[PDB]
Design an enzyme around this catalytic site. Structure first.
Site, PDB file in Angstrom:
ATOM      1  N   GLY A  16       0.807  -1.198   0.000  1.00 15.25           N
ATOM      2  CA  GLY A  16       0.000   0.000   0.000  1.00 15.25           C
ATOM      3  C   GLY A  16       0.844   1.253   0.000  1.00 15.25           C
ATOM      4  O   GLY A  16       2.016   1.237  -0.385  1.00 15.25           O
ATOM      5  N   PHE A  20       3.244   8.631   3.948  1.00 15.55           N
ATOM      6  CA  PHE A  20       4.083   9.139   2.871  1.00 15.55           C
ATOM      7  C   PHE A  20       4.699   7.896   2.233  1.00 15.55           C
ATOM      8  O   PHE A  20       4.723   6.825   2.846  1.00 15.55           O
ATOM      9  CB  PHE A  20       5.236  10.067   3.306  1.00 15.55           C
ATOM     10  CG  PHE A  20       5.995   9.594   4.511  1.00 15.55           C
ATOM     11  CD1 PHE A  20       5.500   9.779   5.788  1.00 15.55           C
ATOM     12  CD2 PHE A  20       7.238   8.973   4.352  1.00 15.55           C
ATOM     13  CE1 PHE A  20       6.208   9.343   6.895  1.00 15.55           C
ATOM     14  CE2 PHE A  20       7.948   8.525   5.453  1.00 15.55           C
ATOM     15  CZ  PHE A  20       7.440   8.717   6.727  1.00 15.55           C
ATOM     16  N   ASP A  22       5.626   4.646  -0.630  1.00 15.25           N
ATOM     17  CA  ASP A  22       5.070   3.324  -0.873  1.00 15.25           C
ATOM     18  C   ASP A  22       5.684   2.256   0.024  1.00 15.25           C
ATOM     19  O   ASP A  22       6.823   2.372   0.494  1.00 15.25           O
ATOM     20  CB  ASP A  22       5.287   2.943  -2.332  1.00 15.25           C
ATOM     21  CG  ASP A  22       4.560   3.872  -3.273  1.00 15.25           C
ATOM     22  OD1 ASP A  22       3.486   4.367  -2.865  1.00 15.25           O
ATOM     23  OD2 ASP A  22       5.070   4.133  -4.408  1.00 15.25           O
ATOM     24  N   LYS A  38       9.606   0.262   3.384  1.00 18.31           N
ATOM     25  CA  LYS A  38       9.118   1.581   3.019  1.00 18.31           C
ATOM     26  C   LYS A  38      10.177   2.360   2.271  1.00 18.31           C
ATOM     27  O   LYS A  38      11.317   2.375   2.711  1.00 18.31           O
ATOM     28  CB  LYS A  38       8.735   2.407   4.240  1.00 18.31           C
ATOM     29  CG  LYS A  38       8.002   3.648   3.739  1.00 18.31           C
ATOM     30  CD  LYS A  38       7.236   4.226   4.954  1.00 18.31           C
ATOM     31  CE  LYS A  38       6.456   5.384   4.497  1.00 18.31           C
ATOM     32  NZ  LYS A  38       5.096   5.537   5.101  1.00 18.31           N
ATOM     33  N   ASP A 128      -3.440  10.328  13.612  1.00 14.95           N
ATOM     34  CA  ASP A 128      -4.010   9.654  12.444  1.00 14.95           C
ATOM     35  C   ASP A 128      -4.637   8.332  12.847  1.00 14.95           C
ATOM     36  O   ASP A 128      -4.371   7.285  12.254  1.00 14.95           O
ATOM     37  CB  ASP A 128      -2.942   9.514  11.360  1.00 14.95           C
ATOM     38  CG  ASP A 128      -3.528   9.237   9.996  1.00 14.95           C
ATOM     39  OD1 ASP A 128      -4.742   9.470   9.820  1.00 14.95           O
ATOM     40  OD2 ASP A 128      -2.785   8.755   9.106  1.00 14.95           O
TER      41      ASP A 128
END
Ligand code: A1AD7
Length: 285
Positions: A16, A20, A22, A38, A128
């Site tokens: 996903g 910030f 991919d 990442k 978040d």
């Protein structure tokens, strides 16, 4: 032949995106375990990966904090490698046809409150809070709820003094509008109260299957805000859940939440409904 990052992690396909960059699957060939990778272009204007790697390291060893395996550079990208975790609560919720039972919602609640309290104990706020950012463990850790994605996380006090950030306004909505606190929608600098309030919306999201403010066509965010503010907490589930959301809204900007009270709130319900403390989730059965 096959691509291996630092010759160590066989590269897999994409999983996903995060706050910030991919995210990719990999295999740790030497350790024999799956991992998550990442990447952030080192050429990026505002690098974000180093701050998140710095935050993970200070929390390392905490329950439900993923372990960092490698953080290097390869090609045009900076890389951080974590142990692979299991499905997110969002993926388990969809896997279960968008229906979780009260027992599971309550079992999740105990750990999710505990994860935010831990984050707060380390001087950060998550900012978040959403089902996508809680992942179950793999294998023998499959009973452990993890918290991820500290890319929007912010320090809310100073390590030495414990002195809170200043009140501030006119700040764009950071994170996801669906689970954002009313304060967040108002442009108020986010604080500790807002992480738990968002969680309160997560719990009702698991109960309802959607939120009263989710179906709607700058304006979309405005529409979400107005519906939530215009919706009373009481506007069919056990009352302990409603007491939680009202409590979070009453917190002051700088207030320390009573984390122990909130956990005990749901556990007393857990006991009165007489669910077993066997930690069996809907997707276990
Ligand atoms: C959104 N998101 C989901 C994940 C993720 C998925 C599966 N297992 C995982 N284990 C540790 C993190 C993670 C990440 C991620 C992955 C590596 C990293 F350095 C930083 N974040 N971001």
């Amino acid at each position: 032949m096959e691509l291996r990052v630092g010759n160590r992690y066989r590269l897999g396909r994409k999983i996903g995106s995060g706050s910030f960059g991919d995210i990719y699957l990999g295999t740790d060939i030497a350790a024999g375990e799956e991992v998550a990778i990442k990447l952030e272009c080192v050429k990026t204007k505002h690098p974000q990966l180093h701050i998140e790697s710095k935050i993970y390291k200070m929390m390392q060893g905490g329950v439900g904090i993923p372990t960092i395996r490698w953080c290097g550079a390869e090609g045009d990208y900076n890389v951080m490698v974590m142990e692979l975790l299991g499905p997110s609560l969002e993926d388990l919720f969809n896997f279960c046809s968008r229906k979780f039972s009260l027992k599971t919602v309550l079992l999740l609640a105990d750990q999710m409150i505990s994860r935010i309290e831990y984050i707060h104990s380390k001087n950060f706020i998550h900012r978040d809070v959403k089902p996508d950012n809680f992942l179950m463990g793999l294998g023998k850790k499959g009973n452990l709820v993890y918290i991820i994605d500290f890319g929007l996380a912010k320090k809310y006090r100073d390590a030495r003094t414990h002195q809170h950030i200043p009140y501030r306004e006119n700040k764009n909505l950071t994170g996801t509008a669906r689970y954002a606190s009313i304060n967040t929608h108002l442009g108020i600098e986010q604080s500790r109260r807002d992480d738990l309030e968002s969680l309160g919306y997560v719990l009702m999201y698991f109960n309802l299957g959607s939120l009263p403010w989710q179906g709607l066509k700058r304006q979309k965010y405005e529409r979400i805000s107005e519906k939530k503010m215009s919706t009373p907490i009481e506007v069919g589930y056990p009352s302990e859940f409603a007491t939680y959301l009202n409590f979070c809204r009453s917190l002051r900007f700088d207030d320390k939440p009573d984390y122990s009270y909130l956990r005990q709130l749901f556990r007393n319900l857990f006991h009165r409904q007489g669910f077993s403390y066997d930690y069996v989730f809907d997707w276990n059965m």
